[PDB]
Amino acid sequence: MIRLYPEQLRAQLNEGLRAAYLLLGNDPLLLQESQDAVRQVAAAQGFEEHHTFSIDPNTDWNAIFSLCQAMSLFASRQTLLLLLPENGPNAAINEQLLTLTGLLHDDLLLIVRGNKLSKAQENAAWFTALANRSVQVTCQTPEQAQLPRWVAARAKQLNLELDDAANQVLCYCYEGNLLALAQALERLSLLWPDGKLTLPRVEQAVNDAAHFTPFHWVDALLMGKSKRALHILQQLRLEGSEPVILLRTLQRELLLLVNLKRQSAHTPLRALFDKHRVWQNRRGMMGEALNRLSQTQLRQAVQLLTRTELTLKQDYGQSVWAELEGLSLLLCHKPLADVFIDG
Amino acid sequence: GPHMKFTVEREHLLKPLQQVSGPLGGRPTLPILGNLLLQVADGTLSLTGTDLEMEMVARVALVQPHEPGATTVPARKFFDICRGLPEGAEIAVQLEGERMLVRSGRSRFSLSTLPAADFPNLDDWQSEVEFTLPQATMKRLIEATQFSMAHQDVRYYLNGMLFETEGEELRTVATDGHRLAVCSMPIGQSLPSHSVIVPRKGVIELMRMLDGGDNPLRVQIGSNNIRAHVGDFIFTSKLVDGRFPDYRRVLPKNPDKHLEAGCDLLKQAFARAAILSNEKFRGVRLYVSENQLKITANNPEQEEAEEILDVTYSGAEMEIGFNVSYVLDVLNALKCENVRMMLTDSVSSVQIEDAASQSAAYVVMPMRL
Amino acid sequence: GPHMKFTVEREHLLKPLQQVSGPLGGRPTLPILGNLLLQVADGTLSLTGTDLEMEMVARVALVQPHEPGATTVPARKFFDICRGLPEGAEIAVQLEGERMLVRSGRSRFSLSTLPAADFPNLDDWQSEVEFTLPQATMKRLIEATQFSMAHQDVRYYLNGMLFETEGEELRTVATDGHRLAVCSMPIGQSLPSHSVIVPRKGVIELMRMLDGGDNPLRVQIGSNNIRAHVGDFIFTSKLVDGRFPDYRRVLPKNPDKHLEAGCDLLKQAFARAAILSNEKFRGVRLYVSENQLKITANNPEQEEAEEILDVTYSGAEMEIGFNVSYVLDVLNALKCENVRMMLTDSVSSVQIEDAASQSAAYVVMPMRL
Amino acid sequence: GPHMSYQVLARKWRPQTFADVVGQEHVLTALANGLSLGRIHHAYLFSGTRGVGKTSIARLLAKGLNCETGITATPCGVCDNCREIEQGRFVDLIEIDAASRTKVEDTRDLLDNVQYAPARGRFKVYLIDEVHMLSRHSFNALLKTLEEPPEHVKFLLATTDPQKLPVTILSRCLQFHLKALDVEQIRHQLEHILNEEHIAHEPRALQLLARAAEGSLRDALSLTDQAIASGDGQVSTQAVSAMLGTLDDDQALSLVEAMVEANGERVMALINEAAARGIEWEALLVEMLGLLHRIAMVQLSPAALGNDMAAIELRMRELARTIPPTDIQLYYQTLLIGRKELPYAPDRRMGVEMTLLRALAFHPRM
Amino acid sequence: GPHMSYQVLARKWRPQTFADVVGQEHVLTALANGLSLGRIHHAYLFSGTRGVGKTSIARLLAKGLNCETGITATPCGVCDNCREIEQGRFVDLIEIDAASRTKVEDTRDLLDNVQYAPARGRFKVY
Amino acid sequence: GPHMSYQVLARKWRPQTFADVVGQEHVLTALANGLSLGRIHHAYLFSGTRGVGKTSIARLLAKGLNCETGITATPCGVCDNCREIEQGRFVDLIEIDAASRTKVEDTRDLLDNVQYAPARGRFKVY
DNA sequence: GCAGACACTACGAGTACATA
DNA sequence: TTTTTTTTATGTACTCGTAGTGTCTGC
Ligand SMILES: Nc1ncnc2c1ncn2[C@@H]1O[C@H](COP(=O)(O)OP(=O)(O)O)[C@@H](O)[C@H]1O
Ligand SMILES: Nc1ncnc2c1ncn2[C@@H]1O[C@H](COP(=O)(O)OP(=O)(O)O)[C@@H](O)[C@H]1O
Ligand SMILES: Nc1ncnc2c1ncn2[C@@H]1O[C@H](COP(=O)(O)OP(=O)(O)O)[C@@H](O)[C@H]1O
Ligand code: BEF
Ligand code: BEF
Ligand code: BEF
Ligand SMILES: [Mg+2]
Ligand SMILES: [Mg+2]
Ligand SMILES: [Mg+2]
Ligand SMILES: [Zn+2]
Ligand SMILES: [Zn+2]
């Protein structure tokens, strides 16, 4: 059971194909690159027939019968690709993968891709059945701390001169969308054959196609960055994510913040975080959030959140995408909020 | 003015319409693609039906006075108008503005038309090779090979059927990766060796197009299309730039075992085994002895089927499993008194032929079970 | 669960198995609804199929040793197993626990079962009245009114057909709110008027059971259920509860305008005119003039169709718009040569009748005029 | 008939050379350089808002790729292939209205022609328009085709919403996003189009027409034709101004502007117009409340402008700067009370008028 | 008056010509000018509140498009086409009640027959 | 047994003629005037509170509209059409519980079936 | 006969979206 | 570095797989 990064994939690919390759993660670009590299090296090894099946509760399940072990009529080595759903496999998909793994042979190479499996599913019977035979590839989006380094690395891959300001602009505009970043690098290489990249046009050949998640929004709120929080909210509204998931994601952290602020007057935050099982990534963030906010601001935040919840589940109105905005400004570097606007 | 003056007999018109309306189907890629092209010229009417890869043209002679012209008419509507009229009834046709007036006695219909300039026309070409075949020969070539053709495969090579011509021999090859069928027939003419691909719909149209009469069939194969002449019907279809293997290469070059069995009994036994075989996972296993050729199958319902034959054999025992549907199709295509079966290994191919005929050969690839 | 050893011949079962097949398989709504009931009792085999609201059993004579009991056997599997055996081949069945071993010569099949108790049956009852009608007459009754039944209409009444009796006449009425079909035929026996409503599916199995034989169909009319008997075949079904519309109230009150013509000519003309009819409405307009009939059809494609028929008419000219599918179905049912029509007004119901005899009658309600 | 012949401005003036497409310079330059260097991706997916030339630019690409003079950014009109592109009857260009042929049957039938060589062109070019709506199985077939595409086939997908496209197709397609056209470019090309035709025009009227369209060129040209029809053959300022007043929709913004300036006659005229343009009063009052909320929020941080107010930013910035937060809070409270009170009032027009009067009464304007 | 058939005023007094339409001077003038001068656009959308004339004006435009006296801004009542339009039996005025035919299959069917030319009319109106 | 089930007063005492109304005179005068003259309309919408009489008023209107005596302001119970309308089973009076069948499919089927001519009734009342 | 083929039409199920 | 995260009731389309129904073709 090997574990690897995309950068190291060639190292395993030029050594010899394993029984199967699992492409887990959430980056379309990284997963696509890994799958394409595996397919290319398999074709170099003499793999010609490719069949792609999407795992769905209603999809075809002829893949089990597709393992005829009789291709010999033409004798073209087969590669099988499976696309896991957004939430990963279910029980039925579990035994389907069990019976597919049980029929694996040398002539067939299995490529499995999808969203990263949770711990409850990482102990599934089929996944264990792939032990000592499979190479997992970790493809998780680098965060804004690590994203500029990745952008610089890919720019060096294309032999393009990337300026720091251009790197920052591309990181800001295309956060959470690596495929968009690769397309932008290709498009800017096409626009400028000279190879350099500077502000006057990288700020022109770009759009706000960033994709975010509610966790990014909650992190922005905790760090008190109003501009980033509002931009993330706008991007999430444009993407069409349901407001209820935003409400729940912010409610969990806000309730934790209220409890921690209440308990801070008697116990140091260092022990409080450990009691509440706060991860090292978020301990400092929540410490700064607590040090920035007072009880009154948290009470106003929860009042606004309650009003938003009521106006969402009772009046069915569309004003929620406005109210959340105010809640953003309610918790960032001197909110200076109001009462009638929220109360 | 341009008028489609027609005075035809329903018996001279039903069959050509029944032929030209074949390739046409519902939901066309263009509205013009759903209308048959009428073209009256000289003293004959040309009926044209196209799919952007076919042109099916039927020429019908005329006797009554008529005026030249070209237009289009809906396929199903006009065909049913011709069909519904009484036997021996004349059909008169005219064009007024953009309306085709079809009259017969007192019956009158006014169908909607389209301009004839918008109808696509396949480009002119020169024929590379020319064949002359009997109807029965081409019929047997198609019916005994088309069943093994692939269906909607990602590899566009296997979607069609291969014609391989060598000297006085013409053979058809069809495969899907798991089955393969080849059939060779003799011709009275010397012909250059040539391998050509015909698409699935093309071979379907070719099979349905030929009649049961004794009229000779003419074949033309060019650089990138094929044409067939049968009486007053001409069908032209594009080809496929594809790669196919050697039939000898796929079949066991050195066969190891020989079996001779009755076709009907084996068909019945395989069908009976397929009854309890999984409807999706169609497949059985055969175990061979001097007389026992046991066929076994089972379903996820734990219902097992085992059956025994009385087949001549003198070699070693062997267990080979494969899809029941493949052998059922092979036997149904054979239509022979006795069948010979050649086995080499479980992971190797399985050949099937006619015990008194080497004209048609079939090979199936057994699946591990 | 005693052992179940059948020893039967195909020729005595394949027809009863086909008859008992009916509406089995298809859509399995729940498992214990089951496949068949095989019962051995007193040297007879009873084979039962159901639909959770319907039941039918075939009786097969057992001229050989047997073991009484009741169990189940899969419908499609048993039917195809019996069908695929060699003609006249014997069948030997054994029961081991819940497993059926079916043997034919050297062919062996294993089958799964379900307990006979889990099967759902229909509660017994006391029959109300009983008829013994000839098969040909019953077929004439059913075929004259089968087509007019509604297609899953909200008005549940229209989803079936009514059988009623008056002395020596049996009257059958079907309707869907736009068509009416009534047929009265002599019985030979006098029984009180006990109307019954049979659903469409039940009527379908009544049609299937009839074989045009000399054995008269026996029927037991109950309160909320129906039973039928054809030789060794017994059938039963539920009933639609309610009252049908009064056909006498639907039939025209003043059928002053009379028309008579040939069935074949009218059917062919209507078939020709329906080609250009609106595929969503199928409405045609009929103009009746002195000794002349005119049919006009239009469709959204703006195509026009006109047809003229020679007829005998002594009344005044009239325009009436009505469905062409309905009249086509009526003429299809009417198998004689000459057909008469009774008309009253431009928006009045039209009565279709046989010219030879009153026999059966039909009513068509016109479209918007 | 007896009216000579006059086509539609929207369909006419569609560019036939890459130099006739106005705006979207980055996409055109990138395509030109890609065709010059011979670096062509397998699939080009265009995207953007309505009426910015995605289909027109894709058609230009299809014309260029099969030009007999060679693959160039400026295909000639001379080539008979180019002429057949103009007429819409080209064997090697397959235009598929994917909005109509959504089912997998038709898509598979049209994608089974990839095995056939082009008739008279270097590349078999598919122009699948409105790709966003397409059955899932049709997406599977298209993905299977794009995974192993023949070297003589190039795809030209067009859409309005790229989000609905599956990620598996996006990851295989070079995506070109087209910006909403700037107002100045729209006005410039509108001036040139009106001058090329024999239609008189006025500068302020032209500016009004350009501003009315929300950055989409088709909107601008459609409004231009409608104004010409209403303008008695002349694009006059008064006629187009009255037309746009009739088609004016953002009533709530003008209501807020008049209310905050305590202009009773102006707000009465505006509400009369909003009554004549039949609308829902609850929706109008909700829009007013939301606009006031946004104005209150922007004063706290400019970043509250976002993207929705791209065409509204100019007035909202002035309103946020010039008005104290307390007055905005009082107006928001008054309008919220009015909205709560509206259904129980007389016919809702009366209630909206009364709420606006309540809000107006606060200022000392007489 | 003399009509014993007491036709509903909502039906009997539907506008016949552009002179019988009260109000809506904007749309009336626009259509009159765009039909007298020419330049007939290929798609119209009448947006307004209930019972203002969202359909009758469309029928008036349909009458004004394909009239025997040519493209006219004054729909006559003498030729067969205008009277057929008013009676609702006209061949080319395909009145698509989008409420009933709302499924995509019906729209595909409507688009399939678009090229099949008009019968007894300058234009076919959908 | 005259009451096989308890014919509750809310069902037994349903009005059968226009004279049994408890005083909805403002609408009854309009209904009687309309039926007496030729002024008949094709869409009546009775609204108000619960248990006030609008379903009974509608049924009385149908009885008056379909009775074979003629279009009578006072329906006659002797009429066969009235005999069938007061009970169920009338081929013309199609009563649809809108809440029971809210789906657009049922309404579309009803509007497809409305085209057919009525059976033996002056007006097909929905 | 004729039953299979082939069409053709309908129904369930899974999915996406709307309005309240 | 790792997991974290949803409001239903009712209705309306859309599209594909599977089956039920007609009918008719050389079988
Ligand atoms: N970039 C552009 N340059 C010139 N005209 C344009 C442009 N974009 C849109 N148009 C105008 O709009 C009309 C329709 O444009 P089209 O490209 O079909 O838009 P879409 O992206 O929605 O398919 C064109 O005829 C043209 O007049
Ligand atoms: N502008 C108008 N002039 C005259 N009558 C009108 C006008 N608008 C509506 N009506 C009346 O309303 C009836 C139906 O109008 P209609 O045009 O169907 O309105 P809609 O726009 O809702 O379809 C007409 O018969 C007419 O009596
Ligand atoms: N105007 C009335 N005259 C006599 N009885 C009435 C009247 N209105 C209501 N009722 C009584 O109320 C019962 C229900 O009346 P109904 O007409 O169904 O009211 P609704 O308008 O709410 O449907 C009737 O059975 C009758 O007893
Ligand atoms: F043709 Be565009 F997408 F409006
Ligand atoms: F009655 Be209108 F068309 F709304
Ligand atoms: F109870 Be009533 F119909 F309002
Ligand atoms: Mg477009
Ligand atoms: Mg209307
Ligand atoms: Mg009521
Ligand atoms: Zn050129
Ligand atoms: Zn006229």
Ligand SMILES: [Zn+2]
């Ligand atoms: Zn009466």
